[PDB]
Fold this protein.
Amino acid sequence: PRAAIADIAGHLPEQVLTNDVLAQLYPDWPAEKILAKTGIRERRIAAPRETAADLAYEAARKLFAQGAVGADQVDFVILCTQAPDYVLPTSACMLQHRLGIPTHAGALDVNLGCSGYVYGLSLAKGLVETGAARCVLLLTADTYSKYLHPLDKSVRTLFGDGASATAVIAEHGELERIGPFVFGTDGRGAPNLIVKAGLFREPKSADSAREHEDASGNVRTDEHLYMNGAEVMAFSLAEVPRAADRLLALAGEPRENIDCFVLHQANRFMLDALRKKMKIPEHKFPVLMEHCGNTVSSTLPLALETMRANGTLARGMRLMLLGFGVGYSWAGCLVNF
Amino acid sequence: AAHPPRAAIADIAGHLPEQVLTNDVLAQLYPDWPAEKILAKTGIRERRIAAPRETAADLAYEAARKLFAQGAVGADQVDFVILCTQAPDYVLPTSACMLQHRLGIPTHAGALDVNLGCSGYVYGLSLAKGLVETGAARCVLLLTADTYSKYLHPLDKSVRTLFGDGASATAVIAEHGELERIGPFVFGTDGRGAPNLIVKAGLFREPKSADSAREHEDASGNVRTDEHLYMNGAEVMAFSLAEVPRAADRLLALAGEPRENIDCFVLHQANRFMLDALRKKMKIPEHKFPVLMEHCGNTVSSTLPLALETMRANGTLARGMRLMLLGFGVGYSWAGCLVNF
């Protein structure tokens, strides 16, 4: 049995964070400058008590209307998120019931960020190709908005909330539909993208709530996300092209045979810099986050969904998916869609 | 000619923290619960407790160190890390990413955390088998670690007599042979069980509030707040008696495996009362049904690997033995698999 991506559905929340609203709040960053630097026109923001699991539920509901998978067919749920409902129970467990998925389905949460979709795909494929599941519902959902400091311009210009639902199912055929994979993990990158306080390394205290303004005027606490953009970019340029070359070597595949290199949609500056260093033509390199921003684990499936809708992704197309970010963590895989 | 890669358990190592919470100390804290009564009801004499700033990942780190010291695998061979925990270091980044680095594991290793509880090990095994047998990894380091102690209310007798902290490291490697060494699996999830085993407040569904810090006393005189673990023992027990025997039956049927061919039924080591009820309902003989948590208590995802480690230490687990592993708990979530050790 060969694992294949059967179908994808995305969901973005209602509230829009526009560049014009960010410009009102940050004088030094007008709409044209934010767009110039990031390529992001707007991000969607989850309602105040709307969680990542809620966005994933909506994504799954949308998926289940499309004609490839429904609740009754799901026999494993993987929720990739970095904003779960509880420390316990597992958010995927409640999504199982909420979606009407059968009680004989597996369910678990995975904590990864912008690498999470590719990793999720490797788990789903492992489950399908070992006969542990015939239909893995891979969910990604994030609400980074809930831990961005209001005066942290660097992250509020980038991050949007969102979710996706992908069905990975047992198919039969001669071609590998998902894989092979290359993985990466480098925990030295931890301090460059981190919410330091609020779980078990550092519980919340008087100190963790203490605000602190950086060189660029960005205010933060240990309870909010800290992103070292310069470090993350350095990491990305160092590791992603490397992983792409290694993945091609692993697969015995010339780079000309790849129809599309779909990268985690970090922002237009990062993607341009990666595209240039990777020598990939723009027509093989979608940049599709203008209206949703960086949705963390959902960037890839949202991109793929858009590509299907706009006619640029069709069955039999040879893709490279590349996810990279917080951890540090990164992963790539080939897909024969 | 050549045999496909088979995921097998190369080795297991456990780590428990230093501090011991004994029945005698519990009997001082809860005057109406003498040591002998705690023992009769739970079959647990001691639990280990993580130091105040020691996290589950820290415990996992030491389990992994001990595993490499046992010599079946080394850090340099690890190409994937799965940490199963419900007390991670941060909301982000992933605690597995930091363990990768701390353990000196190569950066081409995959790493991720899984949130599950007492079902976690069997689920973990399914993921590790998936990675190994699809060729995505040759040596998956499956870590379990929990520090439930950190969210037990001091006056919640029900949970404090049960739970211990701990971790384990399992090396799941590619063997090559005729026998499926890990699998098949049966899975279960039932989110209706959510309210019966839960830490309500502190993450994104219910942020901490004035009310979540308010203590309340329940029907049994146990005190907690919504920021602490709530466990409805009655419901969890009823769930366990309903699903675990069904899961076991379902698994054997799926595997075409007669019940008699299982050498050992290794169940999540919830406590003696639960395990006794399950053994009797499942009609399994005592010698095929280890109860091995007297000195560590219920260590959540680590119950199974710690039990397996103990069986190896005392010579009741050997290569070639046919096991059923059953994990079941918070979620609700449960899972079973067969193992040819």
